[PDB]
Amino acid sequence: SMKKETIERRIEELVKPHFNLLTESAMQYSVTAGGKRIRPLLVLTVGEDIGVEEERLVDVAVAVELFHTASLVHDDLPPIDNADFRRGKPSCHRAYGEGIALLAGDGLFFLAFSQIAKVREPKLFEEFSETAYKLLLGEAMDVEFERQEKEISVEMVEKMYSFKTGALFAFCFSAPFLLKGLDHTFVKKLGEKFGVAFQIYDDLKDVLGSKVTLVKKMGVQKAKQLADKYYEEVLEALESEGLHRTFDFLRNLKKM
Amino acid sequence: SMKKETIERRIEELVKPHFNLLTESAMQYSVTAGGKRIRPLLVLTVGEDIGVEEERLVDVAVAVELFHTASLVHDDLPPIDNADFRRGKPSCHRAYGEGIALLAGDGLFFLAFSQIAKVREPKLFEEFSETAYKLLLGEAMDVEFERQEKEISVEMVEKMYSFKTGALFAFCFSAPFLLKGLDHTFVKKLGEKFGVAFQIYDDLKDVLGSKVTLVKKMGVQKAKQLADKYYEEVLEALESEGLHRTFDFLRNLKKM
Numbered sequence: 001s002m003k004k005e006t007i008e009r010r011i012e013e014l015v016k017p018h019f020n021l022l023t024e025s026a027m028q029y030s031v032t033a034g035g036k037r038i039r040p041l042l043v044l045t046v047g048e049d050i051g052v053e054e055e056r057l058v059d060v061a062v063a064v065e066l067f068h069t070a071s072l073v074h075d076d077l078p079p080i081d082n083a084d085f086r087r088g089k090p091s092c093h094r095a096y097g098e099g100i101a102l103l104a105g106d107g108l109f110f111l112a113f114s115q116i117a118k119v120r121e122p123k124l125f126e127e128f129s130e131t132a133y134k135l136l137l138g139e140a141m142d143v144e145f146e147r148q149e150k151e152i153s154v155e156m157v158e159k160m161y162s163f164k165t166g167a168l169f170a171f172c173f174s175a176p177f178l179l180k181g182l183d184h185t186f187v188k189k190l191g192e193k194f195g196v197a198f199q200i201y202d203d204l205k206d207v208l209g210s211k212v213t214l215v216k217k218m219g220v221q222k223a224k225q226l227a228d229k230y231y232e233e234v235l236e237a238l239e240s241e242g243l244h245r246t247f248d249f250l251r252n253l254k255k256m
Numbered sequence: 257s258m259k260k261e262t263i264e265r266r267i268e269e270l271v272k273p274h275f276n277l278l279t280e281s282a283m284q285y286s287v288t289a290g291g292k293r294i295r296p297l298l299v300l301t302v303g304e305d306i307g308v309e310e311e312r313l314v315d316v317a318v319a320v321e322l323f324h325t326a327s328l329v330h331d332d333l334p335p336i337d338n339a340d341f342r343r344g345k346p347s348c349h350r351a352y353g354e355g356i357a358l359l360a361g362d363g364l365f366f367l368a369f370s371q372i373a374k375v376r377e378p379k380l381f382e383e384f385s386e387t388a389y390k391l392l393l394g395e396a397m398d399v400e401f402e403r404q405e406k407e408i409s410v411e412m413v414e415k416m417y418s419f420k421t422g423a424l425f426a427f428c429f430s431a432p433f434l435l436k437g438l439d440h441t442f443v444k445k446l447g448e449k450f451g452v453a454f455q456i457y458d459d460l461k462d463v464l465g466s467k468v469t470l471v472k473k474m475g476v477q478k479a480k481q482l483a484d485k486y487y488e489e490v491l492e493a494l495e496s497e498g499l500h501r502t503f504d505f506l507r508n509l510k511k512m
Contacts (some may be wrong), residue, residue: 023396074362079355099335102358103396106330109362110389113369117382125381126373133366140279140359 026096026104040065047176049243063115070108131171138164145212154217166195193230200227282352282360296321303432305499319371326364387427394420401468410473422451449486456483
């Protein structure tokens with residue numbers, strides 16, 4: 001909870017309005033409406049596990065969360081998911097209108113890139129930008145696959161999960177290893193699998209609360225089995241590598 | 257026209273679809289619908305004037321144009337400017353729908369950042385990201401100032417021009433100087449003034465074709481006088497510094 005307070009403190013500093021714009025207030029609103037902050041917490045725990053300096057780590061963590069927030073702002077818009085609420089509060093476009101919300105999403109994206117640029121590591125810039133574009137393609141696949149569950153293969157759906165959710169989690173693992181100068185080939189693969197499992201668990205959560213998903217394609221049993229398999233692979237790798245904090249974090253996360 | 261062909265060739269390579277998505281086709285569409293390419297041409301002419309290697313220059317030029325294209329895609333959307341047409345062809349959302357167009361705009365932004373990241377110069381990443389956020393704030397000001405010409409000061413309107421249009425032109429001057437390792441403090445100021453003049457000339461063009469603008473605040477005579485003054489200052493600086501190609505380019509541009 002201390003790491004989370006660090007994240008909340010820094011992210012609110014970055015989205016405090018400076019030019020007296022409604023669009024700035026909308027950016028702040030979407031951040032303050034909150035979230036579990038799983039992605040920036042993962043950046044901090046992985047970084048702490050491998051001895052990365054806190055300051056550059058905080059920059060990366062908040063960048064990832066700003067990017068995630070921005071993606072939700074655009075995804076909620078009426079032409080996409082058309083959500084009136086997020087986390088029990090009006091969605092950004094309900095609070096401010098579609099135009100202001102669209103711009104707030106753009107602003108949050110650009111703030112994210114600005115924070116990554118502060119870290120001053122060329123490979124990180126490149127990796128973040130590649131991740132961003134993958135995430136966008138993933139969202140495009142999700143939108144475009146709608147009403148085609150029969151014509152879309154399970155392989156294409158898993159690819160969409162990998163792009164839409166996996167890529168940003170892979171970056172949460174990759175980025176600290178880049179900051180530390182350690183090879184990130186292994187752990188990036190871990191983040192992608194964790195991300196696919198994460199999205200499936202979200203799917204299953206939605207189903208019990210009573211779009212092409214892996215639950216639709218595979219059925220509930222096979223989808224959960226896949227998610228469990230991936231989750232267990234990730235945990236075992238983390239434990240094996242002595243990534244203690246990350247293991248504990250993700251172990252306690254699976255209960256939730 | 258040869259430089260422009262180089263720009264068109266490279267930008268079409270980058271937006272050729274790779275994943276068979278409509279959103280990719282929409283990205284390509286908005287690029288192919290065309291433009292005068294003034295910004296990337298300026299990057300190439302300034303860079304050639306100071307002896308910057310062509311390849312890294314091309315990357316920056318296409319990045320700037322991808323960013324500009326993306327900004328137009330979002331600005332045309334129904335909640336913002338609601339344009340049915342751009343350059344005589346349907347706007348992106350008319351061609352593909354608002355959802356796909358929104359995502360295509362995001363994709364174009366991320367492609368722009370990806371291309372800047374390829375250049376591998378930390379200060380450039382940072383400068384581009386700062387420029388992007390300024391441009392967004394500028395667009396937010398433009399949208400928010402609507403229906404308030406009396407309550408908005410001329411100073412606030414000029415600030416909006418500086419952010420919305422000036423910042424990207426300043427980057428067109430700054431970026432080659434960064435690539436060459438030359439101090440860019442002077443020329444960045446030049447690009448900002450050129451950008452304000454550019455937007456005023458656009459305003460005046462629209463008026464003769466028969467939102468708070470400097471033409472509304474200052475009247476036609478004073479607005480044109482300001483634009484002319486800025487344009488002349490920029491030309492004289494370019495000529496004085498031996499930026500021959502850039503001078504000739506912008507001199508012939510003022511006729512148009």
